[PDB]
Design a protein around this ligand. Structure first.
Ligand SMILES: CCCCCCCCCCCCCCCCCC(=O)OC[C@H](COP(=O)([O-])OCC(O)COP(=O)([O-])OC[C@@H](COC(=O)CCCCCCCCCCCCCCCCC)OC(=O)CCCCCCCCCCCCCCCCC)OC(=O)CCCCCCCCCCCCCCCCC
Ligand SMILES: CCCCCCCCCCCCCCCCCC(=O)OC[C@H](COP(=O)([O-])OCC[N+](C)(C)C)OC(=O)CCCCCCCCCCCCCCCCC
Ligand SMILES: CCCCCCCCCCCCCCCCCC(=O)OC[C@H](COP(=O)(O)OCCN)OC(=O)CCCCCCCCCCCCCCCCC
Ligand SMILES: CCCCCCCCCCCCCCCCCC(=O)OC[C@H](COP(=O)(O)OCCN)OC(=O)CCCCCCCCCCCCCCCCC
Ligand SMILES: Nc1nc2c(ncn2[C@@H]2O[C@H](COP(=O)(O)OP(=O)(O)OP(=O)(O)O)[C@@H](O)[C@H]2O)c(=O)[nH]1
Lengths: 347, 57, 52, 320, 49, 26, 120, 63, 459, 60, 99, 98
């Protein structure tokens, strides 16, 4: 992708996404998705390896199909209501018909299949764009239509996402697959509170975004995609793997780190709505997330790992790359718990 | 002995006490934040004396 | 909208089509303009919950 | 900033900088074949700046002062041991090859940078597509096990395929028995300790894989050593080399940008030399890797980012 | 000096540091000044002054 | 000195699937 | 909750009636912690780029704290404003709706009968 | 310090915490009542505005 | 109460900016200073707790714990002097930071005035200890050690969180003072018994309870020397201090369904003590004896008799100390011989007489010999149990059968007996070991003379 | 035997930690490891539509 | 060789270098120092000056207040014959017994 | 609701069944991808003509313009499915299973 066009490659993804938040007409919300979709494919193949073309295509059929279902849910609602404004659906099946589609856009239900698969082929930088930005657009629609979503529908699909998402993480050794299942589980965390209160899903979305931002920052900086290659990084840069641990603790949600507040606030709000068994169930299942975080941490900084001799060549040089903002996200996504009341700003 | 080395060997010591006496301030600073029932606790509504202002700071 | 800019900067991008009772080319009325006229001014600024 | 996002957008096209005299050149030959002085001749005659043969401490030449930082702190290998007793438990042969090839990776990476940034050419001694001659030669000499070779050539295709073959490669053809007689009269005890089959083996790999599978790559103009002393003969062949065949002509500014991105930042040119393989000669346990880096930490200068260390003499750190 | 090559930050990047202090003070005096306006605005808002 | 992971310990979390069976073996 | 509040102006950080609230103090502990957060970003940045983590790039640290303090100060103004707004329609609804909010004539413990559990 | 310090100060802790405790219980039930009946400032969901509709005479009479 | 909190918060810049040589000299010289500052918190009223601010307060129950933690912090410093001398300076500063941060979270946890503030700082302590146990550990299994630690503690911690927010939405406040004054009877509904199960099992896990105790043998044994003492000494006792706090609203269901726990403690205390007498690893003995004493205090809280709360505090500090010298002593044999097998090193008084003197007085302290507060607190549990049930004595009386059966047993096979003529490694005792030994045991005889302050709030 | 080998080192360590950790480990590969062919993935999407639409019938 | 590793280092006996060691650090001047730090405050003012503080608490839990008051109250009801403390404290006049 | 709306709605239903229930040709799948556009286009055109929604009469073509865009990029995914694998059948692309 030519640098100058690589910029507008990403520009329409952002504006195509931005169309989803700012529009009030259902067709425009529909239009914002393929503009995101059609421009998201080439950057996934920016490296252009056979794995990249493999990764991009499974995204396309999954995403195009989801947008295809998105279209009728608009139409049946239009047929049964005659309005395009983003409000509650006036026909129950159209509601469930949309919620089914937006999940495939989101990787919540068994649809979650496509998420770990595409993450492997697409590069770390592309993954940084995928699990973070490509989730904002579906969330905005769900928050707007939150009035008339079937509570037992959203809760069930949220519960499974944290179930398989946490459980599938306890098999992988490639960091990208581990990361995707972690994102899949976090996908469930926000979406469980979606019917009750939509402020919390933004709050957990924000914490998820900055943490996953800072997470990939470290992965690019370590330039590793396999635990063994990451295990090496204790030698060349111990600071990178030292902070690798701390943000991995925020993964599990272990207090007093930032990652606790999403789980904390959601459980509080859900308990206000007399759902106590459900928050308790995801609370236990979140330990599976923390488990492969710990093993990932174990091979990172608690225990030294066999390095090589040609790596002492690396000691002479350093990262000429930067990308700004890694220092900010480590701080923002690790030490922010003493600022819970700021969540009311989202309100 | 040269002033600079004593700073470059013994200067972190002098900070722990002031850190503590700093805490004493917010402990005092916290005190007036909740005066509330100034001399209307039932045990201790002792009649005010002109020399002072209230029962305790 | 999620982040309402159509209201903020004051320019209509999609409201003109959102309903069938809005102004149409050469004043071609919709099939149910009378009903959508009544329904819209019934539940306007009263509340989505206080509408059904 | 170096050539990057902004530079391409601004208008930095390396094709404008690239010219006829912009050539990556290297001279190959047997051990002490004298490809070195011939590389000197093609350097100043054809207005071309030259990179010396990559060594164990060539990286230490690139960064800092240029001095060969302690061998234990840089490469933990010595060609003395390889030349004296190459068949030992420590396997010094592959430790030499892996480090030297990594140095050749750097020694070629900056050569591409010189052409890409300035356009003034490079004269090298050997190159990345020359170390398989030694490794294949010494493996055939009963010098290493098979697993080391399968990992060396694997990382070789991982890295070298990214870069771009040199414009022209010169050769100084010398008979092997002359080379053996040449070493007998050098005097350094280590280079006495060689195998004549090894001296023919580098020639074989030069005449079997290097020259044949690089002729169709960029250019072979095999010059005899007897034609090599007459420096005019070698240099005159150069400008009258059309150099049509090769991937250089079909190298648009798109591929130039991708090459410079990879070769500019030095942590990616040799990112894949630390392939997590577990050869006995390549893997150092936790304890040395801990201590040795702790040594490299107190090694002068190389503790913080360059220009940020007070031990060197870097000033105005508080506003740096 | 020790390094043969002039490192990227070997010499003080005099302009880039220049904005950072200049940005910081601007960031400052806007912050306090804002605080004063928000304060005295509040006093007249509820009739305190 | 404290124990540190050896070559064998790395191979445990070193397969294509870090806890494999027959289906994931090949 | 309150995106549907009457008179609510989207894309407006601090509305006009927010100014009637007490502005957060400069020495507000939450504000100074946000500054301390800006400091912590300073150490990490020097750490990632392997610079002297305590004396290098003081200009960078100075920007790294002031920016956090500013966005901090504005954030707390919004933080107080929403909580004040929530407390506003709070007391508006209690006064306008007396019947649904009973004030039981709660009576002292001498008249109530709470069972005593003999523990042993 | 004597007992008037801790006594009056602990009174302040309890009174502030009691008012905070009862305000929380009111907020939970107020939020419930607002979401159920909808006659409240918050918890109001967007409805189509009237000004979008057009009152100009159309081509057909019966409208 | 920021008299103690802030100087410990500041201690991190202190150690981090300290010079190369001092660091530990710096770390101790100020941690003792903070200790006497925390010694101030011995000022209690009769029953009204010391309410320092809206969020921080302390009482006659919390204060002995605060002094225990704050004064402990120098001890693992000097204890870790030997073990961690070889390591570079930066990790040295990082390791002290973990110790200070751990003690930091401990002091706020014990002094929180709101239940969730306690909870956030309750389980905030596993994060540093997980670092300590796993990174700085010695033997291979330390990897699985940390996993067992956090997962066990968390498996009960999350149910507490769901319960805590429920009480918030139900009563309106989780603050200790408000919940105590507005305490209401917890009914016998199946919903309420699970609520009781939620608010109890969290502390029971890191009590531990018989069956729910595997982490300590798999953690304390392979934990670093400093880490090992801190876990048993105080990080055992967050659940206890919480337990007497949350037991103000669980009535009356506690007196009805505490029987399975009273069961599992009573049989477990004999079971743990008996197996303690039959381990080949000495470090496992202090671990297994710890829970045996620890199983005793769960009995105290369950009957919730005033006398039971008396000894719950005293035994907590007594055992919290008691495990400390033994782990310190068990450490001293280890690095000298690089093994934790009591069989390998026997009769050390023939080589280290002074070490033996410390060994036996710590042992008889474990025996609960009066007038030491070990017995009087432990004895009050017996009296409360007899009030609960006269029969109770025999099962616990069986605990006064196994304790000394093992608590002098390693003496007669570690410090007492003959020596194997092959270990020339054993050398003289560096004064550090005896010095820390002095600050370890000398207190327990000191406040023995004056037991009322560490007796507890029930005075 | 009854203290360490039977109960403590095995039994209490078998019931909660080993068995439950096994369960996570046991059915992880049933749900994590998948064939990867595109056909079955969207085939799985099929029945998800009916069960949502018909079996539980989130519409009703 | 497999994994190239250093030989296991031997324990550094502090006493062999300086036979006045203290198990604190290699350098003797810091070694004798670290004692004078712990053998300062540690035993000196934490225990000894600590003990006089804890043993001289001003009326810890005011048990003497109850004492002299207990002396004070019993004589009053014993002077007029009242059987001191009474079965009930919240006396029947102000409580409201049910029905 | 009349049978015209009926039979069109049922048409998209087996378009889904054709779409996700796959076969050994990616082309035939993307054939069904642009096929289900037919139902939605025809469906949508039926209402707004029926309701005399003059403004929304541009929504079909706007929908239909974006329709082939999916096909447009869909075909380009096919060609380097062929460029690198020669064929089109969807089983050789599984290297990302790992
Ligand atoms: C939360 C809120 C705060 C968030 C703020 C944003 C945080 C940003 C973090 C970035 C990640 C850091 C990193 O490691 O980057 C790796 C990677 C660059 O790695 P590299 O190997 O250094 O790049 C080599 C060049 O690409 C080689 O370059 P080339 O020669 O191929 O030419 C390409 C060049 C052309 O452009 C330029 O040269 C300029 O573009 C780039 O280099 C990439 C940057 C383009 C920036 C465009 C900005 C448009 C406005 O950066 C990215 O992948 C960037 C992705 C796009 C922007 C980031 C979006 C992430 C945030 C999404 C959610 C936002 C919040 C939602 C709530
Ligand atoms: C770490 C501890 C703190 C955690 C909480 C998150 C802190 C970081 C993010 C704070 C800034 C983001 C929210 C505020 C903001 O920038 O814009 C708010 C708002 C966003 O506009 P908005 O709120 O009109 O539209 C967004 C829609 N919702 C509310 C659903 C997200 O900006 C405004 O100008 C307010 C307009 C009216 C608000 C109603
Ligand atoms: C605290 C939480 C994590 C605690 C455990 C960390 C892992 C175990 C300790 C070893 C870490 C790796 C290592 O080698 O650390 C030392 C290394 C160099 O020290 P550093 O200060 O960064 O640079 C020299 C100039 N000061 O420094 C580093 O590698 C970085 C150390 C970072 C410490 C945590 C920072 C958290 C964010 C603030
Ligand atoms: C209140 C302020 C406190 C801080 C400022 C004042 C510090 C000094 C206080 C009085 C100290 C009296 C004893 C002095 C002994 C001096 C021994 C000596 O000279 O050691 C020097 C040496 C470091 O090297 P150099 O300084 O270069 O000298 C040797 C050169 N070959 O070798 C070394 O290792 C030097 C170590 C000396 C340490 C002295 C004690 C430091 C701590 C003192 C305060 C402790 C209490 C803190 C709280 C007080 C209030 C409650
Ligand atoms: N194994 C190995 N040896 C290398 C490599 N590069 C250089 N050498 C050594 O360096 C010399 C390479 O051959 P020459 O450069 O011809 O030898 P020379 O003695 O430097 O003499 P000149 O021909 O004048 O350059 C031999 O001693 C090689 O063993 C490499 O990549 N691998």
């Amino acid at each position: 992708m030519n640098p100058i066009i690589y910029t507008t490659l990403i520009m329409t993804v952002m504006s195509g996404t931005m169309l989803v938040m700012i529009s009030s007409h259902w067709l425009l919300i529909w239009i914002g998705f393929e503009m995101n979709l059609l421009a998201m494919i080439p950057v996934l193949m920016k490296n252009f390896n056979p794995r990249a073309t493999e990764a991009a295509t499974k995204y396309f059929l999954t995403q195009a199909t989801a947008s295809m279902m998105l279209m009728m849910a608009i139409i049946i609602n239009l047929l049964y209501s005659g309005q395009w404004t983003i409000t509650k659906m006036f026909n129950p099946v159209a509601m469930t018909m949309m919620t089914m589609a937006l999940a495939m856009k989101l990787g919540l239900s068994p649809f979650h299949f496509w998420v770990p698969e595409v993450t492997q082929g697409i590069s770390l930088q592309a993954g940084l764009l995928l699990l973070t930005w490509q989730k904002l657009a579906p969330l905005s629609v769900l928050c707007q239509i939150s009035q008339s979503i079937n509570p037992n529908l959203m809760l069930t699909m949220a519960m499974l996402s944290i179930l398989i998402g946490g459980w599938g993480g306890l098999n992988q050794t490639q960091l990208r697959k581990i990361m995707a299942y972690s994102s899949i589980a976090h996908m469930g965390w926000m979406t469980a509170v979606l019917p009750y209160n939509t402020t919390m899903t933004i709050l957990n979305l924000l914490i998820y975004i900055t943490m996953t931002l800072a997470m990939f920052m470290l992965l690019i900086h370590s330039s590793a995609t396999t635990t063994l290659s990451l295990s090496h990084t204790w030698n060349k840069m111990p600071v990178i793997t030292s902070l690798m641990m701390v943000t991995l603790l925020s993964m599990g949600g272990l207090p007093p780190l930032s990652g606790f507040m999403p789980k904390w606030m959601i459980i509080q709000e859900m308990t206000k709505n007399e759902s106590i068994i459900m928050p308790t169930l995801m609370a236990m299942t979140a330990l599976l997330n923390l488990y492969f975080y710990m093993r990932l941490a174990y091979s990172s900084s608690l225990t030294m790992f066999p390095s090589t001799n040609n790596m002492k060549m690396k000691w002479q040089f350093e990262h000429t790359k930067q990308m700004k903002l890694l220092p900010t996200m480590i701080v923002l996504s690790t030490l922010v718990l003493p600022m819970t009341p700021a969540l009311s700003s989202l309100n | 002995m040269n002033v600079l080395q004593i700073v470059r060997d013994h200067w972190v010591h002098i900070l722990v006490p002031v850190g503590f006496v700093f805490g004493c301030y917010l402990d005092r600073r916290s005190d007036e934040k909740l005066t509330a029932f100034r001399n209307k606790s039932l045990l201790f509504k002792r009649e005010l004396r002109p020399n002072e202002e209230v029962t305790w700071k | 909208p999620f982040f309402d800019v159509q209201k903020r900067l004051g320019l209509d991008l999609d409201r003109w089509m959102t309903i069938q009772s809005a102004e149409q080319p050469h004043k071609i009325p919709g099939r149910c303009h009378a009903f959508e006229k009544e329904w819209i001014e019934c539940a306007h600024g009263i509340g989505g919950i206080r509408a059904e | 900033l170096q050539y990057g996002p902004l530079a391409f957008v601004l208008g930095e096209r390396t094709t404008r900088k690239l010219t006829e005299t912009s050539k990556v050149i290297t001279v190959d030959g047997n051990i002490c074949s004298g490809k070195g002085r011939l590389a000197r001749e093609i350097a100043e005659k054809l207005g071309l700046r030259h990179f010396p043969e990559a060594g164990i401490h060539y990286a230490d030449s690139t960064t800092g002062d240029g001095k060969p930082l302690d061998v234990q702190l840089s490469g933990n290998c010595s060609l003395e041991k390889f030349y004296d007793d190459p068949k030992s438990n420590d396997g010094n042969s592959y430790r030499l090859q892996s480090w030297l090839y990594a140095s050749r990776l750097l020694q070629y990476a900056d050569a591409l940078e010189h052409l890409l940034s300035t356009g003034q050419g490079v004269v090298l001694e050997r190159s990345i597509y020359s170390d398989f001659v030694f490794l294949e030669a010494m493996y055939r000499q009963g010098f290493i096990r098979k697993q080391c070779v399968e990992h060396y050539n694997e990382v070789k295709k991982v890295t070298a395929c990214e870069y771009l073959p040199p414009h022209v490669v010169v050769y100084v053809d010398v008979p092997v028995p002359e080379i053996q007689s040449r070493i007998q009269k050098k005097g350094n005890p280590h280079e006495m300790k060689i195998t004549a089959a090894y001296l023919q083996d580098i020639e074989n790999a030069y005449k079997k894989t290097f020259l044949p599978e690089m002729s169709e790559k960029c250019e072979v103009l095999q010059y005899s050593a007897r034609e090599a002393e007459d420096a005019e003969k070698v240099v005159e062949d150069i400008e009258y080399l059309k150099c049509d065949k090769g991937p250089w002509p079909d190298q648009d500014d798109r591929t130039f940008h991708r090459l410079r991105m990879l070769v500019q930042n030095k942590l990616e040119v040799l990112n894949y030399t630390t392939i997590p393989v577990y050869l006995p000669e390549i893997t150092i346990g936790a304890h040395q890797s801990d201590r040795v880096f702790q040594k490299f930490t107190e090694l002068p200068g190389r503790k913080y980012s360059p220009g940020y260390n007070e031990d060197v003499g870097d000033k105005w750190i508080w506003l740096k | 000096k020790f390094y043969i090559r002039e490192p990227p930050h070997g010499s003080p990047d005099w302009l880039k540091v220049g904005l950072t202090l200049g940005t910081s003070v601007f960031l400052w005096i806007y912050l306090i000044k804002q605080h004063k306006e928000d304060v005295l605005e509040y006093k007249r808002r509820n009739g305190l002054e | 000195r404290q124990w540190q992971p050896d070559v064998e310990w790395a191979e445990q979390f070193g397969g294509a699937v870090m806890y494999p069976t027959k289906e994931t073996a090949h | 909750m309150m995106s549907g509040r009457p008179g609510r102006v989207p894309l407006q950080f601090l509305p006009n009636e927010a100014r009637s609230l007490p502005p957060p103090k400069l020495t507000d502990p939450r504000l100074v912690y946000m500054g301390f957060l800006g400091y912590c970003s300073g150490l990490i940045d020097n750490a990632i780029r392997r610079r002297p983590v305590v004396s290098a790039g003081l200009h960078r640290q100075l920007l790294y704290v002031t920016s956090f303090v500013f966005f901090g100060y504005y954030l707390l103004k919004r933080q107080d404003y929403m909580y004040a707004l929530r407390d506003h329609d709070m007391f508006a609804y209690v006064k306008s709706h007396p019947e649904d909010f009973p004030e039981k004539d709660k009576k002292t413990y001498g008249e109530i009968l709470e069972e005593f559990h003999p523990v042993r | 310090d004597g007992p008037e310090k801790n006594y009056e100060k602990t009174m302040a802790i309890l009174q502030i915490e009691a008012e905070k405790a009862e305000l929380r219980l009111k907020e939970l039930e107020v939020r419930r009542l607002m979401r159920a009946r909808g006659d409240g400032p918050w918890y109001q969901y967007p409805t189509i505005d009237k000004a979008l509709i057009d009152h100009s005479p159309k081509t057909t009479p019966d409208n | 109460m920021l008299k103690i909190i802030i100087p410990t918060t500041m201690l991190l810049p202190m150690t981090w900016m300290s010079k190369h040589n001092m660091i530990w000299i710096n770390a101790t010289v100020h941690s003792l200073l903070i200790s006497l500052i925390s010694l101030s918190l011995l000022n209690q009223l009769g029953e009204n707790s010391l309410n320092f601010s809206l969020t921080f307060f302390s009482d006659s129950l919390s204060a002995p714990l605060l002094v225990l933690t704050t004064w402990l912090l120098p001890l693992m410093l000097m204890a870790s002097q030997s073990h961690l001398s070889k390591e570079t300076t930066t990790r040295k500063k990082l390791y002290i930071t973990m110790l200070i941060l751990l003690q930091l979270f401990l002091i706020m946890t014990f002094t929180a005035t709101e239940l969730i503030l306690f909870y956030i700082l309750f389980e905030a302590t596993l994060v540093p200890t997980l670092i300590i146990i796993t990174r700085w550990g010695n033997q291979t299994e330390r990897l699985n050690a940390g996993l067992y630690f956090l997962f066990y503690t968390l498996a009960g911690s999350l149910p507490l969180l769901v319960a805590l927010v429920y009480i918030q939405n139900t009563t309106g406040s989780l603050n200790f003072l408000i919940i105590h004054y507005w305490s209401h009877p917890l009914s016998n509904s199946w919903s309420n018994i699970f609520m009781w199960l939620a608010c109890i099992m969290a502390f029971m896990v890191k009590m531990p309870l018989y069956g729910l105790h595997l982490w300590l043998p798999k953690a304390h044994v392979e934990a670093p020397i400093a880490g090992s003492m801190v876990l048993a000494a105080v990080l055992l006792k967050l659940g206890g201090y919480g337990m007497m706090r949350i037991t103000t609203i669980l009535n009356p269901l506690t007196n009805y369904m505490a029987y399975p726990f009273l069961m599992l403690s009573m049989w477990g205390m004999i079971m743990t003590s008996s197996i303690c007498l039959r381990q080949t690893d000495l470090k496992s003995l202090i671990a297994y004896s710890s829970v045996s004493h620890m199983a005793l205090v769960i009995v105290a809280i369950m009957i919730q008799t005033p006398w039971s709360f008396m000894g719950a505090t005293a035994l907590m500090i007594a055992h919290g100390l008691t495990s400390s010298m033994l782990f310190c002593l068990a450490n001293t044999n280890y690095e000298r011989v690089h093994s934790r097998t009591m069989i390998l090193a026997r009769g050390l008084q023939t080589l280290l007489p002074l070490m033996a003197t410390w060994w036996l007085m710590a042992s008889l302290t474990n025996l609960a010999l009066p007038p030491s507060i070990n017995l009087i607190g432990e004895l009050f549990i017996i009296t409360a149990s007899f009030s609960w049930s006269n029969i109770t004595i025999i099962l616990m009386g069986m605990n006064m059968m196994i304790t000394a059966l093992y608590s002098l047993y390693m003496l007669i096979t570690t410090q007492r007996g003959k020596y194997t003529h092959h270990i020339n490694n054993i050398k003289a005792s560096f004064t550090r070991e005896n010095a820390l030994m002095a600050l370890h045991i000398l207190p327990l005889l000191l406040l023995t003379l004056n037991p009322k302050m560490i007796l507890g709030p029930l005075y | 035997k009854s203290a360490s080998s039977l109960l403590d080192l095995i039994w209490l360590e078998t019931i909660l930690p080993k068995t439950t950790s096994f369960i996570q480990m046991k059915m992880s590969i049933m749900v994590s490891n998948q064939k990867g062919l595109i056909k079955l993935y969207f085939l799985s999407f099929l029945i998800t539509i009916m069960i949502s639409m018909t079996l539980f019938n989130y519409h009703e | 060789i497999r994994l190239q590793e250093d030989p296991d280092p031997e324990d550094e006996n502090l006493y062999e270098k300086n036979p006045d060691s203290h198990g604190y650090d290699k350098d003797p001047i810091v070694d004798l120092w670290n004692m004078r730090v712990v053998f300062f405050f540690g035993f000196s003012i934490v225990l000894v000056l600590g003990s006089t503080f804890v043993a001289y608490l001003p009326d810890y839990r005011m048990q003497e207040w109850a004492r002299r008051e207990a002396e004070r109250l019993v004589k009053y009801r014993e002077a007029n014959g009242l059987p001191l403390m009474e079965s009930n404290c919240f006396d029947p006049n102000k409580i409201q017994l049910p029905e | 609701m009349p049978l015209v709306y009926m039979n069109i709605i049922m048409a998209f239903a087996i378009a889904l069944a054709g779409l996700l229930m796959y076969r050994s040709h990616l082309m035939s799948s993307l054939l069904c991808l642009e096929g289900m556009m037919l139902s939605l286009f025809i469906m949508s055109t039926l209402i707004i003509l029926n309701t005399h929604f003059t403004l929304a009469n541009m929504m079909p073509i706007i929908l239909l313009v974006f329709a082939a865009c999916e096909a447009a990029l869909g075909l380009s995914l096919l060609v380097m499915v062929s460029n690198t694998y020669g064929t089109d059948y969807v089983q050789n692309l599984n290297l990302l299973q790992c």
